Amino acid sequence: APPNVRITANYPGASAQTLENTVTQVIEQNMTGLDNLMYMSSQSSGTGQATITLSFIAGTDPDEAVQQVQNQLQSAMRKLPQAVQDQGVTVRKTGDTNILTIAFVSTDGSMDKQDIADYVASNIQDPLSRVNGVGDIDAYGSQYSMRIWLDPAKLNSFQMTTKDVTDAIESQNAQIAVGQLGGQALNATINAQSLLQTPQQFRDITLRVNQDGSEVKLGDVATVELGAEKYDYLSRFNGNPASGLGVKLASGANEMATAKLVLDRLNELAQYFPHGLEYKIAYETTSFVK
Ligand SMILES: [Br-]
Structure with missing residues (x-):
């Protein structure tokens, strides 16, 4: 059970040649210094979608391996095409x-x-x-994408960690893909198979149960809007x-x-x-x- 960090960018209208030089090549180069990193694979489909999967040494904390990378992506967002930034880069544990x-x-x-x-x-x-x-x-x-924005002030109050938020949505074993936008915001991918398909369903889930025993649901700490893509x-x-x-x-x-x-x-x-x-x-x- 190793850690694997997958990156996903999209530039609609771009040739595979276009995509790599502007995105894939650039993002690779912003993954310059990493620890526990072994190697990095990438591709640039004619689809207009770039993907640079990362791979780390056995015995690496995946959630921290992921959390670590996002901030090199923080520096990387700068360099990518405007529309790639607008589209959103998705960091996913796969x-x-x-x-x-x-x-x-x-x-x-x-x-x-x-x-x-x-x-x-x-x-x-x-x-x-x-x-x-x-x-x-x-x-x-x-x-389609379910864009899930997160209030700073709220997240500060609970002392909650976004890692828990991710796993909290994966816990229901809904056949969904949960990623993270680098640059807070999260993004999920919905199929025809998924158990949760509507924002109501997304808002009406329990991330955490507090010590006072109350339920914590997404809509209190996160703003769930559809993403038109x-x-x-x-x-x-x-x-x-x-x-x-x-x-x-x-x-x-x-x-x-x-x-x-x-x-x-x-x-x-x-x-x-x-x-x-x-x-x-x-x-x-x-x-x-x-
Ligand atoms: Br044809």
Whole structure:
């Protein structure tokens, strides 16, 4: 059980070449001096999403490894493109990386962007998560951000730590992805599977039980607002209606074993696509530097 810090930035409209030089290369260079650090992997997808997963020595405090990095990111935010800052960089405790991005296209035009987006959610996402070796699967047309801002003054009063706040939301085992915006603010990713999908649900959870016995809920210390973001790069592929998904790989799993496993499973599903609906696959290679 090692620690792994994953960074996530997004610059919509940027080529893979654009993304790396302006973001990925810059962020890497701001991870200059770290302790317990081993090596750092990064990739720059044509999606417009940068990701620089970090890796530390065995016996490292993950939450403190994470807390440590955020402040080098504090210095890094300065240098990134305006819109990348506006988008928000997400720091998450995971060792998974994107390896495949699949676009589902309507050759006819008999299915609009949101029709296709739904079919992916219902039929495709779930059976591929069952594939041995899959860390996570993101149906972009079925996902969105929950921006959770935090009052300084409040957080000061409780003597609470943000680490607890993170785990408090992961404790319910809702199939959600919990990250942290560097620069306070937090950001969660919601799927179609998630147990909590609305801010009411987010506000109505208990982070901590006090010594006086009262319940502490998010809305008292955190302001929960929806984050308007476009998670899918695709409304059209080759001028044809399309929606896509990202395929993250589990930490220990072998890429190629799983890569075949999902695609062969995918081509098992591909036999019964509605007429017109095809798919286009792009492999997402990942750089390695130490
Ligand atoms: Br096409």
